[PDB]
Structure 1
Amino acid sequence: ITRLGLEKRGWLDDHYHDLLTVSWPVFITLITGLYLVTNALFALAYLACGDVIENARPGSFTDAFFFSVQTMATIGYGKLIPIGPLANTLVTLEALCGMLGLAVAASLIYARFTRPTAGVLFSSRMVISDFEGKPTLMMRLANLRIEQIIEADVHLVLVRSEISQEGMVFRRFHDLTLTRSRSPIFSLSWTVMHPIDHHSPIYGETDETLRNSHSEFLVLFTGHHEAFAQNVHARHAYSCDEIIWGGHFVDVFTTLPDGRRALDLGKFHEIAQHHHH
């Protein structure tokens, strides 16, 4: 949806987010590029001063570009030294830039290092089938890394359209009661279940009624990943179509032919359903 006020950019809000999200190769290409053009600009600036670089072919961009590069990176070989206030002032400027550039490039790199992905797999569907004697809404999550997640929290939120007394129709949110919503240590898989008891918002609902109310289900996951020593977040949304009534997730905890327990995420998205003649 379009906004009408100040829809784009601001302070510390250039496409800086892009430098945080984009792929490493693209990130390195952007930096490398920004590195070359800046040395291209200083190279010109030196030429715009005439022949202020000793031992350099007059009016040559090359020798001027490489002089810049040797100044900014602070390599300072010594054959291409500066000449006269003009060059020595651009050098002072270019010295500061390379320092700021490094400072920045290091900031962005450490940042990108600290915004890791949750590495959490969400089942492609939800199911509503009996558990402990009651119809239950379920879905499951799997930890795709060997590192464990500490203090994992999950929320199952129902979003649908309802009518107020004043006659207004708005989107209402419902944090659904889970049998377990907190997991001290998340390591493998976790089946999140919502018992549909008399207190449930979807009690008495059917696939049809949920469609009418434009019902949707949000799953929000958060925890402290040991792999990154910092919190991670992940979420998924499910529409009515993605709910398998009568479905039962296929166990993923396999017992190996040789007395060992194993987890086979290959069956993670499998649902067992009964068929009628």
Structure 2
Amino acid sequence: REVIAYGMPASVWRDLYYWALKVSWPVFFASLAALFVVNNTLFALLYQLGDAPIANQSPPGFVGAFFFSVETLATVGYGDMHPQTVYAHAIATLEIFVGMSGIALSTGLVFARFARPRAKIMFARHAIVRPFNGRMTLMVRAANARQNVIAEARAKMRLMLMKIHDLKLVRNEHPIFLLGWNMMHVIDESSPLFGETPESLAEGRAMLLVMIEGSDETTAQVMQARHAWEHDDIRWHHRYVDLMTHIDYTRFNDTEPV
């Protein structure tokens, strides 16, 4: 329900909403569909019972109530009235409620899926540490990916487990006018990544953690994304292939030493 190995409390139900809002839009509707079917049968197989018959329609039996059902659960009432007997009515009433209620939770999950924040921030499969305007400085570079932003990013660091406050891999600029961002930080004394070697990190399970946060002007939702680099991912003495006016994005991740 989380990131590497969990044993805690859970409950089918919620786990379900999860899928509801994480699945693809066809797999979604299919999901309903499949449920529509299952929910149309269970009511049909509850019609061929009772104190009297139902399917006063074209279909002889079952296939009647079914196509009857698919006229009430969804509440379309088409026009072949089977309000013939009480038991018969009840069932049909119990249905009407449901489907009406069902349409809700569906129209419901729908909006809930729409509401999923909509922008996404993509980060460089690889970090890099190079010499810059003087001293040694680290670098990570991310960028928008659909409906822009204009964010601020904090940048934390993990070794040993103590999570050290690294001058925000923004250390130079905590924010920016995002439509191409190159987050970076000087490794001078002040910094905790001082005298530390690729060998130094490696042993401390060292991790570079970054999170950009910005609001989507289009929906004003403030959506934040995070990203983690494993020590062996910080590729040394390199740089990012230039990308640009226009930016072309294919080679975003690659690097080359210096």
Residue type at the aligned position of 1:233 = Q
Instruction: Provide the C-alpha distance between the structure 2 equivalents of 1:49 and 1:30, rounded to a whole number of angstroms.
Output: 30
Other-structure match for 2:210: 219
Other-structure match for 1:266: 250
Other-structure match for 1:9: 11
- How many residues align? The count is 251
Provide the aligned C-alpha RMSD in A.
Answer: 2.0
Mark the CA change 1:249 to 1:57 in structure 2 (over 3 Å): closer, same or farther. Answer: closer
Pairing 1:116–2:107 present:
no
Note the 1:96-107 alignment, pairs <5 A. Answer: 96-107=97-108
Instruction: Provide the C-alpha distance between the structure 2 equivalents of 1:35 and 1:114, rounded to a whole number of angstroms.
Output: 24
Other-structure match for 1:197: 188
Tell me which of 162, 165, 181 is aligned to 1:172.
Answer: 162
Structure 1 gaps of 5+ residues are 162-170, 254-260
Instruction: Provide the C-alpha distance between the structure 2 equivalents of 1:50 and 1:59, rounded to a whole number of angstroms.
Output: 18
Shift of 1:51: 3.9
Greater Cα offset, 83-92 or 114-123? 114-123
- Identity of counterpart residues, as a percentage? 36
- TM-score, normalised with respect to structure 2: 0.89
Residue type at the aligned position of 1:176 = D
Note the 1:66-145 alignment, pairs <5 A. Answer: 66-145=67-146
Report if the CA contact (8 A) 1:157-1:175 is conserved.
yes
Shift of 1:120: 2.0
Pairing 1:238–2:222 present:
no
Report if the CA contact (8 A) 2:159-2:204 is conserved.
yes
Q: Secondary structure at the match of 2:223?
A: strand
1:207-258 per-position Cα deviation (integer Å, ceiling 9, x unaligned): 11111111011111222123544222322211111112111222222xxxxx
Other-structure match for 2:158: 159
Pairing 1:182–2:175 present:
yes
- TM-score, normalised with respect to structure 1: 0.84
Structure 2 gaps of 5+ residues are none
Runs ≥4 residues deviating over 6 A: none
Instruction: Provide the C-alpha distance between the structure 2 equivalents of 1:237 and 1:137, rounded to a whole number of angstroms.
Output: 14
Instruction: Provide the C-alpha distance between the structure 2 equivalents of 1:16 and 1:127, rounded to a whole number of angstroms.
Output: 39
Q: Secondary structure at the match of 1:182?
A: coil
Report if the CA contact (8 A) 1:54-1:79 is conserved.
no
